[PDB]
Amino acid sequence: ADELVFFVNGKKVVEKNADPETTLLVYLRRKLGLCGTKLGCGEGGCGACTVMISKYDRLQNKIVHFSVNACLAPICSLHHVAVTTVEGIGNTQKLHPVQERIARSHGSQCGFCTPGIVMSMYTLLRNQPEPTVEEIENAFQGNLCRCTGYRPILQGFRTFAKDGPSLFNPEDFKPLDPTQEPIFPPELLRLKDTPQKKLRFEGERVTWIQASTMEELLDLKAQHPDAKLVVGNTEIGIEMKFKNMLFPLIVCPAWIPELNSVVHGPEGISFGASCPLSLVESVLAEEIAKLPEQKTEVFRGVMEQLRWFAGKQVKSVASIGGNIITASPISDLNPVFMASGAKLTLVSRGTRRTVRMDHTFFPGYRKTLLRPEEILLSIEIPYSKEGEFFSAFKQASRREDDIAKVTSGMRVLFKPGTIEVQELSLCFGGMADRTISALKTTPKQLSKSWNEELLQSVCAGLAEELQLAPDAPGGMVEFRRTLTLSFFFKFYLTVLQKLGRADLEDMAGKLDPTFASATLLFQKDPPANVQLFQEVPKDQSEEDMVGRPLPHLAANMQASGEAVYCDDIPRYENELSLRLVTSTRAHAKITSIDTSEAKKVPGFVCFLTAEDVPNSNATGLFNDETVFAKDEVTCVGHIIGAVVADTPEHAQRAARGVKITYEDLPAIITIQDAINNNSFYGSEIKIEKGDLKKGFSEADNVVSGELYIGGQEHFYLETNCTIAVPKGEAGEMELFVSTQNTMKTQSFVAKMLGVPDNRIVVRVKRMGGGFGGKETRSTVVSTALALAAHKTGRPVRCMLDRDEDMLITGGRHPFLAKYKVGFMKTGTVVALEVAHFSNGGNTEDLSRSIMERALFHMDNAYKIPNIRGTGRICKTNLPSNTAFRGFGGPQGMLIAEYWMSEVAITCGLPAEEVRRKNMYKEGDLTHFNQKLEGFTLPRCWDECIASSQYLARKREVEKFNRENRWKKRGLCIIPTKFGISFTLPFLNQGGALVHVYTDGSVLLTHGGTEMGQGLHTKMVQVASRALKIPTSKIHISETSTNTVPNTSPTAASASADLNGQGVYEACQTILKRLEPFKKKKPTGPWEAWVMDAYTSAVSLSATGFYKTPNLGYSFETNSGNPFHYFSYGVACSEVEIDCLTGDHKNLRTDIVMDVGSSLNPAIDIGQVEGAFVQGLGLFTMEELHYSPEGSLHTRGPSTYKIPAFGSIPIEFRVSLLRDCPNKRAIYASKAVGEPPLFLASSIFFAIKDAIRAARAQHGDNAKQLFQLDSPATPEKIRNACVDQFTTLCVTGVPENSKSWSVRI
Ligand SMILES: Cc1cc2nc3c(=O)[nH]c(=O)nc-3n(C[C@H](O)[C@H](O)[C@H](O)COP(=O)(O)OP(=O)(O)OC[C@H]3O[C@@H](n4cnc5c(N)ncnc54)[C@H](O)[C@@H]3O)c2cc1C
Ligand SMILES: NC(=O)C1=CN([C@@H]2O[C@H](COP(=O)(O)OP(=O)(O)OC[C@H]3O[C@@H](n4cnc5c(N)ncnc54)[C@H](O)[C@@H]3O)[C@@H](O)[C@H]2O)C=CC1
Ligand SMILES: O=c1[nH]c(=O)c2[nH]c(=O)[nH]c2[nH]1
Ligand code: FES
Ligand code: FES
Ligand SMILES: [Ca+2]
Secondary structure, rough: OOOEEEOOOOOOEEEEOOOOOOHHHHHHHOOOOOOOOOOOOEEEEEOOOOOEEEEEEOOOOOOEEEEEEOOOEEHHHOOOOOEEOHHOOEEEEEHHHHHHHHHHHHOOOOOOOOOHHHHHHHHHHHHHHHHHHHHHHHHOOOOOOOOOOHHHHHHHHHHHOOOOOOOOHHHHHHOOHHHOOOOOOOOHHOOOOOOOOEEEEEEOOOEEEOOOOOHHHHHHHHHHOOOOOOOOOHHHHHHHOOOOOOOOOEEEEEHHHOOOEEEEEOOOOEEEEEEEEHHHHHHHHHHHHOOHHOOHHHHHHHHHHHHHOOOOOHHOOOEEHHHHOOOOOOOOHHHHHOOOOOOOEEEEEEEEEEEEOOOOOOOOOOOOOOOOOOEEEEEEEEEOOOOEEEEEEOOOOOOOOOOOOEEEEEEEEEOOOOEEEEEEEEEEEEEOOOEEEOOOOOOHOOOOOHHHHHHHHHHHHHHOOOOOOOOOOOOHHHHHHHHHHHHHHHHHHHHHHHHHHHHHHHHHHOOOOOHHHHHHOOOOOOOOEEEEEEOOOOOOOOOOOOOOOOOOOHHEEEEEEEEOOOHHOOOOOEEEEEEEOOOOOEEEEEEOOOOOOHHOOOOOEEEHHHHHOOOOOOOOOOOOOEEOOOEEEOOOOOOEEEEEEOOOHHHHHHOOOOHHHEEOOOOOOOHHHHHHHHOOOOOOOEEEEEEEHHHHHHHHHHEEEEEEEEEEEEOOOOOOOOEEEEEEOOOEEEEEEEOHHHHHHHHHHHHHHHHHHHHHHEOOOOOOOOOOOOOOOOOOHHHHHHHHHHHHOOOOOEEEOHOOOHHOOOOOOOEEEEEEEEOOHHHEEEEEEEEEEEEEEOOOOHHHHHHHHHHHHHOOEEEOOOOOEEEEOOOOOOOOOOOOOOOHHHHHHHHHHHHHHHHHHHHHHOHHHHHHHHHOOOOOOOOOOOOOOOOOOOHHHHHHHHHHHHHHHOOOOOOOOOOOOOOOEEEEEEEEEEEEOOHHHOOEEEEEEEEOOOOOOOOEEEEOOOOOOOOOHHHHHHHHHHHHHOOOHEEEEOOEOOOOOOOOOOOOHHHHHHHHHHHHHHHHHHHHHHHHHHOOOOOHHHHHHHHHHHHHHOOOEEEEEEEEOOOOOOOOOOOOOOOEEEEEEEEEEEEEEEEOOOOOOEEEEEEEOOOOEEEEHHHHHHHHHHHHHHHHHHHHOOOOOOOOOOEEOOOOOOOEEEEEEEOOOOEEEEEOOOOOOOOOOOOEOOOOOOHHHHHHHHHHHHHHHHHHHHHHHHHOOOOOOOOOOOOOOHHHHHHHHHHHHHHHHHHHHHOOOOOOOOOO
């Protein structure tokens, strides 16, 4: 036929005109209106779109359930299946146990990732009602969360595990009843009695054929070799979406029995090419469990690769044949199949051949071997033989769901009874434009014994044979080469052990006992978590929730997918879609724009440019930005214009047909380019105190150095989004925006349009994360959209794709620092001079205020009598960098801790002793002359050092390092001081509006926006105490410019402080009005007083306002307080590094945080954990790469690696400091959002210690100050662990000299 029939949440869908390009995500959200399932990336990496599929499997003869990425699933692949979304399992009226548990355990903050995580856990439970803790963790390999730090999610779900004051109470969790899950649609069970026939779907550009038999597939390939095979679509979906590939004819062979068979033969196991990787995994796990070890070496090699291959959603549909035929150079399976000589069967109409995978199979970049009319039928994965050993290796940026830098399969076969090499095969991915074998090194080794001279001969060969051009795609050439040698060393040592286990230990020899840990397969301990906080007074009423662990008010709705984010709002029938058109050049003249092709796309409306702007094209915080480029473009990502079309698909197609011609201009990309060109934003910023000349002369030692700190992408799970609704009267417009800054959104729109501010209303219900990235940069979408709405008179909507968002909106400022520190032999610091440089990109934005804050925190926790700090902001042809949680603090403080670590090393004293003796005391003045009152940091230090048992663990670390050569541990304890308040004083103001209706219910609003930090929850808690009524009588619906005007951004961690005071004051006004009625009816309920007030004509509405008193610092006189108070905290972390690969484990972290008297210890601990884990990403794994021409390479989760479930400290302890009220802030609390992020430097410095231990083993001296830039990635860790393998790989750097990426 041509009707597409499937089920969604038990309801039958009949699509009479299915378009092959339509994904399930798009169909669910836009056709069925089910917006619980989210778009977070569109590329299989985040899991936000996770849904469950059920089907009757014809081959297994049973109902099966599995999870998929809705963003990648073509609906045309989904004939006769049943889809379940988050809405299908439960809702707020009846939550599923999974939804209840994630909500109540504080595992949902912003909530944008919650439905996908719910669906991952739900699918696991449908497959395994009693999972293990390990199975639960494994369920989320393809899910990301940017807010929670993962800990609460795993803790809540652990309650499901077979083998798994309080923040939450698991005894209150309702039990699971599997009989209450949705029925498998009866019609579908009826339909399995009728045979499957070929189906044909024809779309706008694409024809899709769902083949039922091999005969039909082969005929079609013979007659149309052009036909594109699609099985899982996990490559083709990406090729179509991101590489703009169009395959007009697609054939899906997934129904064909022959491509799905598993056959056990005498030589191995044959898998049909369409077999999902999940099936390959389950089949091989079975075989490994039942067969003797000696037969399963290759099976275990495949399994070791699949362990770190994507997550459950991808492996459910991704085929074994699809990975082979894709033939990416970084395939994880191809080097294993090549090294094992796996047997491939290829077929076409009338032909059949069997081939062995070897070098000839891959004759070029992303090519086989196969003829245009051939398909891969099956692959035989071999049993290993006696004397045959196998290892598989992968090293990436992150263990989980990542692209290999180097991947490898290695096989050795020994002549019987000997340790002489009969066969040897070493195959590599990531070392060429294809999977390659080391065919020049390995023949030289045949007949040799497995010994030290074989080791040295292979390493020397590999280093000569596996050369890389300085400009090789992927970069990291020294690291990649070092890994090939390091992987062979591990295989060499593993084979020695395997020979000993075969009772040839005397022939082969024993392993040095300090070498044994080098061969261990990756394993973690089970997680252990602690949360400590203070109970509220015994006499506090149960209805006073201030200081109580109240769950986020929207947690239940977030878990159910009922909470509404911008793009979940239904479209008006006349709504249009916008797509931005951006510069592909870093600095160029625009010489012409050609929209000829754009105009041919059906649904095209218009292309907006600078000419269409009614009033002003000048925008941005400092008016130095264009709404749309005029005459020139100044970064790759510079917005030139915007296409308007009927649908987002038509807008994307039209935007591709906008052809721009450029004339290149001289580009300034790097901080050095900018120094050389005197290209800066404003003048040097400077803080200086004491006498530097005297300080340096009195110093026993002086140490100079530099540090580079890489930037950071926010990766809020919800990208930037605006809907502009024009009202057709008086210039009136309403914008619904994911923004932290309603005021500037309103102002920038109004100024662009040329209307007063009173015409523009900006509304924000909630954001799926912001982290500073939506403080200003949101407006580049808002203004373009507001313009399209004005021009058309129709509502217009734009949500950015992840690749667009990462390119356009910028991130944290990269920093370069040059320091000189003077100190005594005692470790006492007497003089410090630091020059800071940041890379600001192509507009000023917040850059100068960021540098100010870096300079305010260059002391960190340390008293330094003679200090000079300067900052310069570089003006470059890069997307403009902006606010990011920390706002320059983390960079400033990392530099401080960096030279401090070198002070301790140079003195030969314990680092903790050096830090402690340099720490401020109560009453000291900072370098900017602010007095330190209520200085809790020494308490945080003493409590953390003791509770973490730092000294006893130091002993164990030193012991570990003496007993292990190729793994090292490190341990560090780091303090922090963080000033709370906007550096711009007048921004420290907040407003509220409160209404009491005649039923006694209260509607509260304030200037702060909800982005997952639980601000509305805290404000309700505050108002409930202030009014003395239960939280249940108070509701906050949204943030709006027309309820509270002139609001500061939700930023600087200040929002609870500012809005809390505003809310408190509005509530006090109301109470004052009710007092005469309270005095008359002293016990009569709240509702009586309110009705009495109303009928006496007393106003039940009030504004409230607050400004932080006594702020205002001058850089000129170094006087006045920039901050209202400081936040304090300490963290101790332990790590274990792999010296041979650069991988590491975060073993344990203990945090003690001063949050005053917490408004909400559940939310505050969640903020501590979330901030800490973002810092962990900043300092250890998050890295952005740019071409030498200033083009961002890193445009999605595939290449940009944020912390995953498996990244977090295995033991994770957080304590909130007891008995530390902060009188000056709302109910004695302190701000919490930004201060804990820098604490993750404890991991950076623990890594540095482990490297120092590794370097003490190979090399001359001693207390050498080696370089470690941030982030400390596997590349930087491995390269710093100088040994015999790095030495054979150094060769290169021919000045000068093209490279894949440049450091900005
Ligand atoms: C989030 C994510 C993580 C990933 N992680 C990894 C990883 O860690 N390691 C790794 O190696 N890959 C990884 N991949 C790549 C990808 O998932 C695998 O290559 C997968 O096996 C592709 O299979 P598919 O069925 O989805 O292929 P499809 O996209 O449907 O097709 C891929 C190619 O194979 C061809 N093809 C499929 N079947 C046949 C056939 N039998 N005969 C001839 N040609 C055929 C198609 O025409 C197409 O050219 C990842 C992808 C994603 C999205
Ligand atoms: N999305 C994800 O999270 C993951 C996807 N996969 C795979 O990653 C692939 C990424 O595709 P692309 O971006 O097109 O990368 P690609 O397929 O072009 O491969 C890039 C890599 O190949 C190597 N390479 C290519 N040419 C080279 C040369 N001339 N010299 C030396 N080395 C060279 C380099 O190691 C480089 O990093 C996907 O197709 C997918 O199969 C694998 C892991 C994760
Ligand atoms: O002092 C600050 N000002 C800001 O505007 C801001 N934004 C932010 O995320 N942190 C800070 N800090
Ligand atoms: S939206 Fe599908 S994986 Fe991110
Ligand atoms: S709560 Fe997980 S991304 Fe925000
Ligand atoms: Ca900037």
